[model samples]
Target chain A: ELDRAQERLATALQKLEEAEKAADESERGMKVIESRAQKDEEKMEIQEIQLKEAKHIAEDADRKYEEVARKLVIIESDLERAEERAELSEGKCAELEEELKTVTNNLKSLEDKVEELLSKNYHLENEVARLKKLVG
Target chain B: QLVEEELDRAQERLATALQKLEEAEKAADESERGMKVIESRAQKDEEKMEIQEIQLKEAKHIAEDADRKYEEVARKLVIIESDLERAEERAELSEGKCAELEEELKTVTNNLKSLEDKVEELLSKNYHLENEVARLKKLVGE
Candidate 1:
């Protein structure tokens, strides 16, 4: 009976050894999983920072586009106003030219009337001089 | 009999330890699977981020080109402004010339009216002198 008990004790020792080995293997696997998780987490953090920086750059680009677009709109408005002014002013110049043309024609017609009246006076004076000589 | 009891206790402890190790292994497996999940997500994140980067580069390039055109238009507007000012100067000068021409027209009108009065008086004086000459001729002939 003592020999059988000793044999059972040896089998139990062998089971304990195997169980310890399995526990060690499990612990090692857990450590490897933890290590990989840590590395992945670090990479994710770096990607997050990159994503955030890209967002900021994109926001700045939007702001710049808006600024330029606003300025272009105002300039376009001012340019249109300037064009209107030029058109109106040019129209005024054309109207003045028409008025000048009419006034110049009036001046020429009046000058012609003066010439005709001078010719008529000369003829009348010559007729009176001839009649005076005939009466004598 | 004491030795057999000890053996039974040791075997039971070993079995218990093995069960605990199996539980721990299961936990590690869950964590390992979690890492796989994270890695899969990271891969998708990389793909999406690459697409975003490409799109962002396109946007940035387009914005830069727009800005360059905006600058060109801005500089062109300066020349247009200068031209507008030049046109304004011409209009101003034209207005002054028109005023001077109107003043000349008024002076010419006044001169023409005065000449008209002088010609009317001269015509009347000549007609009366002609009548006197005719009456004197009739008296001298008789």
Candidate 2:
């Protein structure tokens, strides 16, 4: 009985060590996937920030264009009234007509600028949309 | 003498090695159980997330439908309001026409009443003249 007891004690000690080692290996594997989940979350956060900035830029450009459009309408209406009232042969009136032409060209240029900004903003918004989809 | 001791030590080492293998097997079994539990939990979580996605998609579609329905209802309501306004205008016009017709009817009724009263008075006067003539003729024996 005494000899058998010693053998059993030895076997139990050996088993305990082996179990500990296997547990250690499994723990290591779980840590790897946990780390990947954390990294994915970080990437998602960056994408969210980019989406918000794109929205703000789009809104600002839209407002600026509306202001420019309103100003152009007022200027065109004023020119129409002046042209109807003034004689074409007057030298001073000619100067006024040239000034009106300059304002009209400026308005056209502003409109072109607005269109360019809108296109660029649309591309930015599309980028954010695609990135958000990828993030998910 | 040493051969026996070596055999005894060999037996001891073999038993220890076998015990270690059993422990390793138990550990493998435990690990497999843990993996099964994790996989099952992950599958359940995935199902939950999928359900949530489906619900969100359904809600988005429902909201879009609601927006379209609201627009249709608004158009119908506008048409109804316009029809109601037209009906009210017609009602006002009808009220005026009815008032004019009622006054005309009252004038006609009064005219008929006056004509009947004059005819009855003339008839009575004619009857009295006839009776007076008859009495004078009879007394003169002509």
Candidate 3:
């Protein structure tokens, strides 16, 4: 019976050693997992801050885009109005030029006729003077 | 009796080792389960972080594009404003020229009217001079 008891004790001690080894391995695995989790958490925190900064930059860009778009709209309208006014002014100038040409031509013709009439009247007055001297 | 006592002592030791084995098994199982939980959570959080990184990249790209577009629009606005200013100046110049032309036209018209009146008076005086010369010729002939 003592021998039987000794054998049983050996077997139990062997099993206890195996169980302790397994527990040690599992503990090591848990430690590895904990370390990795800590790294992941820190990385995630940094990423979150980066995302926030990106969002802020996006908002600022969108605001500037809107402002520029609004200004472009106003500038385009002003250009259109200015161009229209310029076109109208050009047309008026063209019309005035054409009318001036016509008036100038008419004035030139009238001046030529007046010059001819004045020369003829002077010759007629000299002829009358000569006839009066002969009749006397 | 002494042998029996020794046998009892060995059996007691065996019982204690078995209890210790049981406790160690329990501890290993608990550690394994805890490790599994932590590993699973870490994997999930890693995936979440990966997705967040992608989101951050996309937002960064969007911001850059928006900045470029803003600059483009600003440049266009500058060009449009300059063109508008030039057009306004041209319009003003054209208007000034048109007014000057209108004034010239008025002056020419008045000069034409005055020339017409002068020609009519000269023609009447010439007719009177011819009539006077004809009456003098008749009297001198008699």
The C-alpha lDDT values of all candidates are 0.65, 0.55, 0.84
Candidate 2, superposed: residue stretches over 4 Å from native: A1-19, A27-136, B1-7, B44-48, B108-142
lDDT of 1 by residue, B1-142 (tens): 5767666666676666666666665665675576667666666766766676676666666666666666666676667667667766666676676677667666766766676676677668667766765675565652
lDDT of each residue in A38-68, candidate 3, tens digit only: 8888988989888888888888888988988
Chain A agreement with the truth for model 1, given as TM-score: 0.71
TM-score of each: 0.53, 0.38, 0.74
Residues A12-116 of candidate 1: C-alpha lDDT, one tens digit per residue: 556656656666676676567567657766766766666566666666666666776676676667666666766776676677667667766766786676667
Better of 2 and 3 by TM-score: 3
lDDT of 2 at B136: 48
Q: What C-alpha lDDT, on a 0 to 100 scale, does residue B112 get in candidate 3?
A: 89
Candidate of highest lDDT: 3
Q: Give candidate 3 regions above 4 Å deviation.
A: A21-27, A59-63, A120-136, B61-75, B78-82, B113-117, B120-142
Candidate 2 lDDT, A2-73, residue by residue in tens: 234345544666666767687787877667645654654565465455545555544554555555555556
Candidate 1 vs candidate 2, TM-score winner: 1
- Candidate 2 scores an fnat of 0.03
DockQ of candidate 3 relative to the true structure: 0.52
